[PDB]
Design an enzyme around this catalytic site. Structure first.
Site, PDB file in Angstrom:
ATOM      1  N   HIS A  14       6.268  -0.542   7.826  1.00  0.00           N
ATOM      2  CA  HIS A  14       6.023  -0.444   9.016  1.00  0.00           C
ATOM      3  C   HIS A  14       6.322   1.527   9.131  1.00  0.00           C
ATOM      4  O   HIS A  14       5.289   1.505   9.330  1.00  0.00           O
ATOM      5  CB  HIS A  14       7.084  -0.555  10.201  1.00  0.00           C
ATOM      6  CG  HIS A  14       6.989  -2.790  10.339  1.00  0.00           C
ATOM      7  ND1 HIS A  14       5.608  -2.482  10.990  1.00  0.00           N
ATOM      8  CD2 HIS A  14       7.460  -3.466  10.117  1.00  0.00           C
ATOM      9  CE1 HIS A  14       5.752  -4.085  10.817  1.00  0.00           C
ATOM     10  NE2 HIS A  14       7.210  -4.997  10.233  1.00  0.00           N
ATOM     11  N   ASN A  16       6.478   3.710   6.434  1.00  0.00           N
ATOM     12  CA  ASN A  16       5.756   3.960   5.145  1.00  0.00           C
ATOM     13  C   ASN A  16       4.492   4.253   6.486  1.00  0.00           C
ATOM     14  O   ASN A  16       3.848   5.337   5.790  1.00  0.00           O
ATOM     15  CB  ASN A  16       6.003   3.118   4.223  1.00  0.00           C
ATOM     16  CG  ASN A  16       7.080   3.356   3.234  1.00  0.00           C
ATOM     17  OD1 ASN A  16       7.674   4.194   3.579  1.00  0.00           O
ATOM     18  ND2 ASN A  16       7.283   2.412   1.867  1.00  0.00           N
ATOM     19  N   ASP A 113       3.558   1.375  16.279  1.00  0.00           N
ATOM     20  CA  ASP A 113       3.315  -0.398  15.256  1.00  0.00           C
ATOM     21  C   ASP A 113       2.971  -0.428  16.728  1.00  0.00           C
ATOM     22  O   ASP A 113       3.337  -1.438  17.686  1.00  0.00           O
ATOM     23  CB  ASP A 113       4.483  -0.705  15.128  1.00  0.00           C
ATOM     24  CG  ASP A 113       4.702  -1.850  14.279  1.00  0.00           C
ATOM     25  OD1 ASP A 113       4.311  -1.329  12.564  1.00  0.00           O
ATOM     26  OD2 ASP A 113       3.562  -2.597  14.390  1.00  0.00           O
ATOM     27  N   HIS A 144      -3.628 -15.186  13.474  1.00  0.00           N
ATOM     28  CA  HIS A 144      -3.112 -14.720  14.473  1.00  0.00           C
ATOM     29  C   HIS A 144      -4.064 -15.704  15.833  1.00  0.00           C
ATOM     30  O   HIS A 144      -3.697 -16.834  16.719  1.00  0.00           O
ATOM     31  CB  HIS A 144      -2.645 -13.933  14.680  1.00  0.00           C
ATOM     32  CG  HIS A 144      -1.416 -13.345  13.858  1.00  0.00           C
ATOM     33  ND1 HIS A 144      -0.722 -14.093  12.752  1.00  0.00           N
ATOM     34  CD2 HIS A 144      -1.212 -12.090  13.737  1.00  0.00           C
ATOM     35  CE1 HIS A 144       0.079 -13.063  12.004  1.00  0.00           C
ATOM     36  NE2 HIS A 144      -0.441 -12.030  12.854  1.00  0.00           N
ATOM     37  N   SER A 272      11.566  -6.086   0.035  1.00  0.00           N
ATOM     38  CA  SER A 272      12.459  -5.733   0.654  1.00  0.00           C
ATOM     39  C   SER A 272      13.924  -6.441   1.320  1.00  0.00           C
ATOM     40  O   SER A 272      15.057  -6.511   1.497  1.00  0.00           O
ATOM     41  CB  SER A 272      12.863  -4.446   1.349  1.00  0.00           C
ATOM     42  OG  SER A 272      11.496  -4.656   2.224  1.00  0.00           O
ATOM     43  N   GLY A 347       3.291  -8.203   0.040  1.00  0.00           N
ATOM     44  CA  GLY A 347       4.104  -7.471   1.203  1.00  0.00           C
ATOM     45  C   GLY A 347       2.452  -7.317   1.727  1.00  0.00           C
ATOM     46  O   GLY A 347       1.920  -6.908   0.901  1.00  0.00           O
ATOM     47  N   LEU A 352      -2.044  -3.704  -0.420  1.00  0.00           N
ATOM     48  CA  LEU A 352      -2.786  -2.639  -0.918  1.00  0.00           C
ATOM     49  C   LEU A 352      -2.685  -1.956  -1.461  1.00  0.00           C
ATOM     50  O   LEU A 352      -3.349  -1.081  -2.345  1.00  0.00           O
ATOM     51  CB  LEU A 352      -2.856  -2.348   0.662  1.00  0.00           C
ATOM     52  CG  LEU A 352      -3.884  -0.730   1.291  1.00  0.00           C
ATOM     53  CD1 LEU A 352      -5.480  -1.404   0.502  1.00  0.00           C
ATOM     54  CD2 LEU A 352      -3.572  -0.627   2.451  1.00  0.00           C
ATOM     55  N   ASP A 369       2.705 -13.199   6.432  1.00  0.00           N
ATOM     56  CA  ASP A 369       1.882 -12.812   6.600  1.00  0.00           C
ATOM     57  C   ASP A 369       1.430 -12.706   4.326  1.00  0.00           C
ATOM     58  O   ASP A 369      -0.078 -12.909   4.048  1.00  0.00           O
ATOM     59  CB  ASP A 369       1.443 -11.732   6.582  1.00  0.00           C
ATOM     60  CG  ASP A 369       2.262 -10.365   6.215  1.00  0.00           C
ATOM     61  OD1 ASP A 369       3.004  -9.976   6.321  1.00  0.00           O
ATOM     62  OD2 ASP A 369       1.334  -9.555   5.593  1.00  0.00           O
TER      63      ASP A 369
HETATM   64  C1  LIG Z   1       7.855  -9.575  13.641  1.00  0.00           C
HETATM   65  C2  LIG Z   1       9.173 -10.276  13.590  1.00  0.00           C
HETATM   66  C3  LIG Z   1      10.030 -10.706  13.876  1.00  0.00           C
HETATM   67  C4  LIG Z   1      11.576 -10.996  13.447  1.00  0.00           C
HETATM   68  C5  LIG Z   1      12.650 -10.714  15.019  1.00  0.00           C
HETATM   69  C6  LIG Z   1      13.655 -11.810  13.918  1.00  0.00           C
HETATM   70  C7  LIG Z   1      12.962 -12.726  13.103  1.00  0.00           C
HETATM   71  C8  LIG Z   1      11.968 -13.026  12.761  1.00  0.00           C
HETATM   72  C9  LIG Z   1      12.477 -12.192  10.362  1.00  0.00           C
HETATM   73  C10 LIG Z   1      12.181 -14.318  11.456  1.00  0.00           C
HETATM   74  C11 LIG Z   1      13.303 -14.933  11.225  1.00  0.00           C
HETATM   75  C12 LIG Z   1      14.739 -14.667  12.562  1.00  0.00           C
HETATM   76  C13 LIG Z   1      14.458 -13.310  13.020  1.00  0.00           C
HETATM   77  C14 LIG Z   1      15.901 -13.795  14.223  1.00  0.00           C
HETATM   78  C15 LIG Z   1      15.334 -12.584  12.255  1.00  0.00           C
HETATM   79  O1  LIG Z   1      15.820 -11.537  11.489  1.00  0.00           O
HETATM   80  O2  LIG Z   1      16.447 -13.780  10.930  1.00  0.00           O
HETATM   81  C16 LIG Z   1      10.265 -12.621  13.036  1.00  0.00           C
HETATM   82  C17 LIG Z   1       9.760 -11.916  12.092  1.00  0.00           C
HETATM   83  C18 LIG Z   1       9.523 -10.826  11.647  1.00  0.00           C
HETATM   84  C19 LIG Z   1       9.794  -9.999  11.970  1.00  0.00           C
HETATM   85  O3  LIG Z   1       9.451  -8.670  11.707  1.00  0.00           O
HETATM   86  C20 LIG Z   1      10.158  -7.606  10.635  1.00  0.00           C
HETATM   87  O4  LIG Z   1      11.448  -8.123  10.530  1.00  0.00           O
HETATM   88  C21 LIG Z   1      12.276  -6.861   9.147  1.00  0.00           C
HETATM   89  C22 LIG Z   1      13.318  -7.167   8.385  1.00  0.00           C
HETATM   90  O5  LIG Z   1      14.145  -7.889   9.790  1.00  0.00           O
HETATM   91  C23 LIG Z   1      10.510  -6.669   8.280  1.00  0.00           C
HETATM   92  O6  LIG Z   1      11.782  -5.821   6.962  1.00  0.00           O
HETATM   93  C24 LIG Z   1       9.367  -6.308   8.432  1.00  0.00           C
HETATM   94  O7  LIG Z   1       8.715  -6.058   7.610  1.00  0.00           O
HETATM   95  C25 LIG Z   1       9.098  -7.210   9.573  1.00  0.00           C
HETATM   96  O8  LIG Z   1       7.729  -6.886   9.560  1.00  0.00           O
HETATM   97  C26 LIG Z   1      11.271  -9.743  12.690  1.00  0.00           C
HETATM   98  O1  LIG Z   2      11.492  -0.269  -5.096  1.00  0.00           O
HETATM   99  C1  LIG Z   2      10.645  -0.108  -4.634  1.00  0.00           C
HETATM  100  C2  LIG Z   2       9.867  -2.003  -3.541  1.00  0.00           C
HETATM  101  C3  LIG Z   2       8.912  -1.001  -2.682  1.00  0.00           C
HETATM  102  N1  LIG Z   2       8.956   0.135  -1.422  1.00  0.00           N
HETATM  103  C4  LIG Z   2       7.795   0.148  -0.873  1.00  0.00           C
HETATM  104  O2  LIG Z   2       7.896  -0.660   0.059  1.00  0.00           O
HETATM  105  C5  LIG Z   2       6.885  -0.567   0.954  1.00  0.00           C
HETATM  106  C6  LIG Z   2       7.840  -2.863   0.823  1.00  0.00           C
HETATM  107  O3  LIG Z   2       5.978  -2.936   1.764  1.00  0.00           O
HETATM  108  P1  LIG Z   2       5.818  -4.300   1.747  1.00  0.00           P
HETATM  109  O4  LIG Z   2       4.894  -4.413   3.265  1.00  0.00           O
HETATM  110  O5  LIG Z   2       5.085  -4.608   0.687  1.00  0.00           O
HETATM  111  O6  LIG Z   2       6.934  -5.087   1.730  1.00  0.00           O
HETATM  112  P2  LIG Z   2       8.174  -5.791   3.002  1.00  0.00           P
HETATM  113  O7  LIG Z   2       9.202  -5.601   1.795  1.00  0.00           O
HETATM  114  O8  LIG Z   2       8.156  -5.088   4.156  1.00  0.00           O
HETATM  115  O9  LIG Z   2       8.129  -7.211   3.386  1.00  0.00           O
HETATM  116  C7  LIG Z   2       5.791  -0.497  -0.026  1.00  0.00           C
HETATM  117  O10 LIG Z   2       5.438   0.499   0.551  1.00  0.00           O
HETATM  118  C8  LIG Z   2       6.244  -0.405  -1.530  1.00  0.00           C
HETATM  119  O11 LIG Z   2       5.355   0.639  -1.917  1.00  0.00           O
HETATM  120  C9  LIG Z   2       9.178   1.169  -2.241  1.00  0.00           C
HETATM  121  O12 LIG Z   2       9.133   2.538  -2.866  1.00  0.00           O
HETATM  122  N2  LIG Z   2      10.213   0.536  -4.228  1.00  0.00           N
END
Ligand SMILES: C=C1C[C@@]23CC[C@H]4[C@@](C)(CCC[C@@]4(C)C(=O)O)[C@@H]2CC[C@]1(O[C@H]1O[C@@H](CO)[C@H](O)[C@@H](O)[C@@H]1O)C3
Ligand SMILES: O=c1ccn([C@@H]2O[C@H](COP(=O)(O)OP(=O)(O)O)[C@@H](O)[C@H]2O)c(=O)[nH]1
EC number: 2.4.1.-
Length: 448
Positions: A14, A16, A113, A144, A272, A347, A352, A369
């Site tokens: 988010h 980035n 966001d 959605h 990640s 991801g 992209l 997603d």
């Molecule tokens: C949209 C979202 C709401 C939430 C809220 C937490 C929720 C959950 C993760 C779903 C699983 C149960 C829990 C409680 C959890 O964290 O374990 C949801 C769905 C994913 C959410 O989004 C971010 O979570 C980050 C890492 O936790 C990702 O690094 C990021 O990239 C995600 O967009 C985080």
């Molecule tokens: O070794 C790594 C792994 C991932 N990324 C960056 O981390 C982001 C990961 O976002 P993505 O939506 O693809 O996956 P997420 O980890 O959030 O589910 C991207 O911009 C990648 O370029 C990076 O820079 N180095």
């Protein structure tokens, strides 16, 4: 001069895209203030041209966020919590900044966001325009809004209806399985995606990290569902997200890539936050070995339960053709000539990024997603292969070879090349993205 305030979700996928958009907007002459938590903050010394202001997080901490873990699954709980309880403080901080606003200066708008759905009424309460940056795809948003048809059809029922489970009713570009894994967290996502959708529709404008020729089938939905103007800008085509890395780049990987023939290296990164059985982990390494392809594998600590890292690897799988690292400048790696393919967790930024660099993909997923992204790229755009049945030794090695070496997969290689070219064309004068960006700049200046 006109200032824009951007407010990201403090996670790598988010921050980035929004700091990319911040840079694009600065290149258009806006000044930039980034509101951000202390948690997961980026390196402000990488942004001397931005003003940072740390909020919501500050050290006299709230009971609800003070003991939340800083990694893994549970850290994401900050998003529901800040949404439900951060309005008062966001309002104060926004209002403080507008009050100190210099003479020549005026805040054009707030860009958050799309998951910061609470910011909409906060902004409204100040007579401040709020725009939304979507960090997932138009296609995903299309799903959605179609949730109610999925629920009533029984798709979002995790236990049973288990039934038809190939090809969805009224959404033919998906299979039933995709929907089930994407919304397997229905309890929490149902509420959140409601508010996110609702407040994105009520905003003053939506910026999508995408481009018209990437998701053309999805434009109609967005026009019909969102009254405010939408703008599609492929952020990775403007600049990489290296400046907003939350980790230390491994940096030694380019000297190794320079020793490999062109298009001969598999880049592999499963996301990640994702997690695998220790068993499945050993199966993944099995497929790589069996592919006979050189690979660069990013493995985040904690990817393996219960190890710190890949301790369960029989030392010496890597040998000559394999390397494992903890973190790289991903898009810069995807741009290096050695890379022939990207095995991704789908991801949206990774997908992209790979599309913008011309690199075809092997798709795994871990819900949200991700299965939707893999379905779309593999079946609609046809720029990768979707391993949609888990982790089997040979299926893994077939997909890698098919993408990287098989004659039968030339069309996938070529499709990735053509799509990259279309991304490049869209940034030029008279391209979809160029005009989206020209419109965004004009639109924001009229808010002011
Ligand atoms: C949209 C979202 C709401 C939430 C809220 C937490 C929720 C959950 C993760 C779903 C699983 C149960 C829990 C409680 C959890 O964290 O374990 C949801 C769905 C994913 C959410 O989004 C971010 O979570 C980050 C890492 O936790 C990702 O690094 C990021 O990239 C995600 O967009 C985080
Ligand atoms: O070794 C790594 C792994 C991932 N990324 C960056 O981390 C982001 C990961 O976002 P993505 O939506 O693809 O996956 P997420 O980890 O959030 O589910 C991207 O911009 C990648 O370029 C990076 O820079 N180095």
């Amino acid at each position: 001069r006109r200032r824009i305030i951007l407010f990201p979700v403090p996670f790598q996928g988010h921050i980035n895209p929004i700091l990319q958009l911040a840079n694009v907007l600065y290149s258009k002459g806006f000044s930039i203030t980034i509101f951000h938590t202390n948690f997961n903050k980026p390196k402000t010394s990488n942004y001397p041209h931005f003003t940072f202001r740390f909020i919501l997080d500050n050290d006299p901490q709230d009971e609800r966020i003070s003991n939340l873990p800083t990694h893994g699954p549970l850290a994401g709980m900050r998003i529901p919590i800040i949404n439900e309880h951060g309005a008062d403080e966001l309002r104060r901080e926004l209002e403080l900044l507008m009050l100190a606003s210099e003479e020549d200066e005026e805040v054009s708008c707030l860009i958050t966001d799309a998951l910061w759905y609470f910011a909409q009424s906060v902004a409204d309460s100040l007579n401040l325009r709020r725009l939304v940056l979507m960090t997932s795809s138009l296609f995903n948003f299309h799903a959605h809004v179609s949730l109610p048809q999925f629920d009533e059809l029984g798709y979002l029922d995790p236990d049973d209806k288990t039934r038809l489970e190939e090809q969805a009713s009224g959404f033919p570009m998906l299979k039933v399985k995709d929907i089930k894994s994407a919304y397997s967290n229905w309890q929490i996502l149902k509420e959140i995606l409601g508010k996110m959708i609702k407040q994105t529709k009520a905003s003053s404008g939506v910026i999508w990290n995408s481009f018209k020729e990437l998701e053309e089938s999805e434009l109609e939905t967005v026009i019909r569902e969102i009254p405010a103007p939408s703008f599609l800008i492929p952020l990775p085509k403007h600049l990489t997200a290296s400046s907003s890395s939350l980790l230390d780049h491994d940096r030694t990987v380019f000297q190794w890539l320079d020793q490999q023939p062109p298009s001969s290296v598999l880049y592999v990164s499963f996301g990640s936050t994702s997690e695998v059985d220790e068993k499945d982990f050993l199966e993944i390494a099995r497929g790589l070995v069996d592919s006979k392809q050189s690979f660069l594998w990013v493995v985040r600590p904690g990817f393996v339960k219960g190890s710190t890292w890949v301790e369960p690897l029989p030392d010496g799988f890597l040998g000559e053709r394999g390397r494992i690292v903890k973190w790289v400048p991903q898009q810069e790696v995807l741009a290096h000539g050695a890379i022939g393919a990207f095995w991704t967790h789908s991801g949206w930024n990774s997908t992209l990024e790979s599309v913008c660099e011309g690199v075809p993909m092997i798709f795994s997923d871990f819900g949200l997603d991700q299965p939707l992204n893999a379905r779309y790229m593999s079946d609609v755009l046809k720029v990768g292969v979707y391993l949609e049945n888990g982790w089997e030794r040979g299926e893994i090695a077939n997909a890698i070879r098919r993408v990287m070496v098989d004659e039968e997969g030339e069309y996938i290689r070529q499709n990735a090349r053509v799509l990259k070219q279309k991304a490049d064309v869209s940034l030029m004068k008279g391209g979809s993205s160029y005009e989206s960006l020209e419109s965004l700049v004009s639109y924001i200046s009229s808010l002011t």
